[PDB]
């Protein structure tokens, strides 16, 4: 199964890699999954604060995402009406 480890294709992206590109390679996740409180790879998700809460949408509820990821359940959380 193996690995040239790409660069990445292994890296050890919790999720995964770009690979690279200016990062040279990083690690992705589901790409608003992104460096939680800590390690330079992680997701969990992105929730760059001042909270994200919860408070999903109005209308569509595509929403409250992160389920999958979860593990939810602060608020409900994980979406930043923020900016
Ligand atoms: C890096 O940029 C090049 C084009 O310049 C292209 O291969 C792609 O957009 C990027 N590579 C990755 C990591 O997908
Ligand atoms: C948002 O800020 C937090 C810490 O304040 C940090 O993880 C990162 O710099 C930004 N993005 C994410 C994924 O949190």
Domains of the chain: 1-46 (2.10.25.10), 47-83 (2.10.25.10)
If you take atom 7 of ligand 1, which residue's CA is the nearest one?
A: 21
The technique by which this structure was obtained is NMR
Structure tokens at 71: 């593990």
User: By CB neighbour count within 10 A (0-12 exposed, 13-18 middle, 19+ buried), where does 4 fall?
Assistant: exposed
Mutation test residue for ligand 1: of 16, 18, 21, the one with most atoms within 8 Å of CB: 21
Q: CA quadruple 46, 49, 54, 58: dihedral positive or negative? A: negative
User: What distance in Å separates the CA atoms of residue 58 and residue 5, rounded to the nearest whole number?
Assistant: 43
């Amino acid at each position: 199964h193996m690995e040239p480890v790409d660069p990445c294709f292994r890296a050890n992206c919790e999720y995964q890699c770009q690979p690279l590109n200016q990062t040279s390679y990083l690690c992705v996740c589901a790409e608003g999954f992104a460096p939680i409180p800590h390690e330079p790879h992680r997701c969990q998700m992105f929730c760059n604060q001042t909270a994200c809460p919860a408070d999903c949408d109005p209308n569509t509820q595509a929403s409250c995402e992160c389920p999958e990821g979860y593990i939810l359940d602060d608020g409900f959380i994980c979406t930043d009406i923020d900016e």
